[PDB]
Design an enzyme around this catalytic site. Structure first.
Site, mmCIF file in Angstrom:
data_model
loop_
_atom_site.group_PDB
_atom_site.id
_atom_site.type_symbol
_atom_site.label_atom_id
_atom_site.label_comp_id
_atom_site.label_asym_id
_atom_site.label_seq_id
_atom_site.Cartn_x
_atom_site.Cartn_y
_atom_site.Cartn_z
ATOM 1 C CG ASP A 147 -28.334 -0.027 -8.714
ATOM 2 O OD1 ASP A 147 -28.336 -0.711 -7.669
ATOM 3 O OD2 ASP A 147 -29.222 -0.149 -9.589
ATOM 4 C CG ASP A 179 -26.189 0.905 -13.862
ATOM 5 O OD1 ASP A 179 -27.176 0.203 -13.546
ATOM 6 O OD2 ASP A 179 -26.101 2.117 -13.567
ATOM 7 N NE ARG A 219 -30.016 -4.375 -8.393
ATOM 8 C CZ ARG A 219 -29.741 -4.187 -7.103
ATOM 9 N NH1 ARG A 219 -29.595 -5.227 -6.292
ATOM 10 N NH2 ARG A 219 -29.623 -2.955 -6.620
ATOM 11 C CG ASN A 220 -26.539 -3.038 -11.711
ATOM 12 O OD1 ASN A 220 -27.177 -3.341 -12.728
ATOM 13 N ND2 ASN A 220 -26.981 -2.149 -10.826
HETATM 14 N N1 LIG Z 1 -30.398 -12.106 -18.717
HETATM 15 C C1 LIG Z 1 -29.962 -12.350 -20.101
HETATM 16 C C2 LIG Z 1 -28.891 -11.382 -20.440
HETATM 17 C C3 LIG Z 1 -27.575 -11.790 -20.401
HETATM 18 C C4 LIG Z 1 -26.575 -10.901 -20.719
HETATM 19 C C5 LIG Z 1 -26.875 -9.603 -21.077
HETATM 20 C C6 LIG Z 1 -25.805 -8.697 -21.409
HETATM 21 C C7 LIG Z 1 -24.631 -9.194 -21.932
HETATM 22 N N2 LIG Z 1 -23.551 -8.488 -22.268
HETATM 23 C C8 LIG Z 1 -23.724 -7.189 -22.027
HETATM 24 N N3 LIG Z 1 -22.781 -6.237 -22.274
HETATM 25 C C9 LIG Z 1 -23.256 -5.009 -21.926
HETATM 26 C C10 LIG Z 1 -24.537 -5.169 -21.448
HETATM 27 C C11 LIG Z 1 -25.320 -4.049 -20.993
HETATM 28 C C12 LIG Z 1 -26.693 -4.077 -21.091
HETATM 29 C C13 LIG Z 1 -27.428 -3.002 -20.647
HETATM 30 C C14 LIG Z 1 -26.801 -1.904 -20.101
HETATM 31 C C15 LIG Z 1 -25.429 -1.867 -19.998
HETATM 32 N N4 LIG Z 1 -24.822 -0.723 -19.444
HETATM 33 C C16 LIG Z 1 -23.723 -0.768 -18.609
HETATM 34 O O1 LIG Z 1 -23.264 -1.795 -18.125
HETATM 35 N N5 LIG Z 1 -23.201 0.496 -18.399
HETATM 36 C C17 LIG Z 1 -22.315 0.814 -17.354
HETATM 37 C C18 LIG Z 1 -21.181 0.065 -17.122
HETATM 38 C C19 LIG Z 1 -20.326 0.413 -16.094
HETATM 39 C C20 LIG Z 1 -20.597 1.503 -15.294
HETATM 40 C C21 LIG Z 1 -21.727 2.256 -15.522
HETATM 41 C C22 LIG Z 1 -22.572 1.909 -16.557
HETATM 42 O O2 LIG Z 1 -23.717 2.634 -16.819
HETATM 43 C C23 LIG Z 1 -23.587 4.007 -16.917
HETATM 44 C C24 LIG Z 1 -22.453 4.591 -17.441
HETATM 45 C C25 LIG Z 1 -22.387 5.968 -17.520
HETATM 46 C C26 LIG Z 1 -23.443 6.742 -17.082
HETATM 47 C C27 LIG Z 1 -24.572 6.147 -16.561
HETATM 48 C C28 LIG Z 1 -24.645 4.773 -16.480
HETATM 49 C C29 LIG Z 1 -24.692 -2.945 -20.451
HETATM 50 C C30 LIG Z 1 -24.839 -6.558 -21.510
HETATM 51 C C31 LIG Z 1 -25.933 -7.342 -21.185
HETATM 52 C C32 LIG Z 1 -28.196 -9.203 -21.103
HETATM 53 C C33 LIG Z 1 -29.208 -10.086 -20.786
#
Ligand SMILES: NCc1ccc(-c2cnc3[nH]cc(-c4cccc(NC(=O)Nc5ccccc5Oc5ccccc5)c4)c3c2)cc1
Length: 293
Positions: free
Chosen positions: A143, A161, A147-148
């Site tokens: 994905d 993500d 947006r990610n």
């Molecule tokens: N719209 C208002 C707002 C602004 C900022 C944030 C914000 C700020 N800082 C952050 N730091 C981390 C997050 C966040 C939130 C939800 C989920 C995640 N997860 C990831 O980013 N994980 C990830 C990263 C890199 C690669 C893969 C990833 O996911 C997986 C990893 C392993 C297996 C499956 C998935 C971070 C955040 C939000 C949220 C809302």
């Protein structure tokens, strides 16, 4: 693994996929820092068994990731309830929202011009470097999209993500045939066979670049979700945004080769851009590090 008393939730940042994301203050999680502002991922009271499993699985898998260009996991509060998944605060949120705010017309315009060419190159390399690290860990994102991607306080861009279920970008997903899929970002072979590889991530990277240069317009604007499936599988790709720099256009064309084996790797992307990046890039990147072999 972090003591529950070292974390304090302050305010809601926004709904993640299976639960609320909070901004919090973390005591003594990083060496040399008495305090750190953090994001804290939680799981809803209405989340299912399958979703809790995905939530916890994500935390576990991310314990093995250390990269300057991937949103870091700092620790987990797992003793007792609720599970708090503590991560680095990305103060400026997702790249799509940020790019859309940079539109001259946008009501939430932060008071700065659209991205310059050098800023686009820097973003591209950072996104590519994070993806290169993940690929070295045999991780396939599935994905990749603006947006990610997330924007830090200093505007460094990192791979994240949020999942697929945030309300704000509902239309970026289509329930094809089955499950929600980011069809406007998907490679032709992923749309046909359902396979996701680092090479399909590269396709998506091409689309991220397109988003950067179009300030996050909807890919294949004039086409319906069903039409996009057919268009891409048959060899269609996006047109270049107006005033798009030639150098970025060239990258896009590399990413959108129909045969995945003709597409570049993320290391190759960084290698193309390396000379024009910030002097700090070699000191923080996966590309320049000992780990890259
Ligand atoms: N719209 C208002 C707002 C602004 C900022 C944030 C914000 C700020 N800082 C952050 N730091 C981390 C997050 C966040 C939130 C939800 C989920 C995640 N997860 C990831 O980013 N994980 C990830 C990263 C890199 C690669 C893969 C990833 O996911 C997986 C990893 C392993 C297996 C499956 C998935 C971070 C955040 C939000 C949220 C809302």
């Amino acid at each position: 693994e972090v003591s529950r008393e070292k974390i304090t939730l302050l305010r809601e940042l926004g709904q993640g996929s299976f639960g609320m994301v909070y901004e919090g203050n973390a005591r003594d999680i990083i060496k040399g820092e008495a305090e750190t502002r953090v994001a804290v991922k939680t799981v809803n009271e209405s989340a299912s068994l399958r979703e809790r499993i995905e939530f916890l699985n994500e935390a576990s898998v991310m314990k093995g990731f250390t990269c300057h260009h991937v949103v870091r996991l700092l620790g987990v509060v797992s003793k007792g309830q609720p599970t708090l998944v503590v991560m680095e605060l990305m103060a400026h949120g997702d790249l799509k929202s940020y790019l859309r705010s940079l539109r001259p017309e946008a009501e939430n315009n932060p008071g700065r011009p659209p991205p310059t060419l050098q800023e686009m190159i820097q973003m591209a390399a950072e996104i590519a470097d994070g993806m290169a690290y993940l690929n070295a860990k045999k991780f396939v994102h599935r994905d990749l999209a603006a947006r990610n991607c997330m924007v830090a306080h200093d505007f460094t861009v990192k791979i994240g993500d949020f999942g697929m279920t945030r309300d704000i970008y509902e239309t970026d997903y289509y329930r094809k045939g089955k499950g929600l899929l980011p069809v406007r970002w998907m490679a032709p072979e992923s749309l046909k066979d359902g396979v996701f590889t680092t090479s399909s991530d590269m396709w998506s990277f091409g689309v991220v670049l397109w988003e950067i240069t179009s300030l996050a317009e909807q890919p294949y604007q004039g086409l319906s979700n069903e039409q996009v499936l057919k268009f891409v599988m048959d060899g269609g790709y996006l047109d270049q945004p107006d005033n798009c720099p030639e150098r970025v256009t060239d990258l896009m064309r590399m990413c959108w080769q129909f045969n995945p084996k003709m597409r570049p790797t993320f290391l190759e992307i960084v290698n193309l851009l390396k000379d024009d990046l910030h002097p700090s890039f070699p000191e923080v990147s996966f590309f320049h590090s000992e780990e890259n072999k």
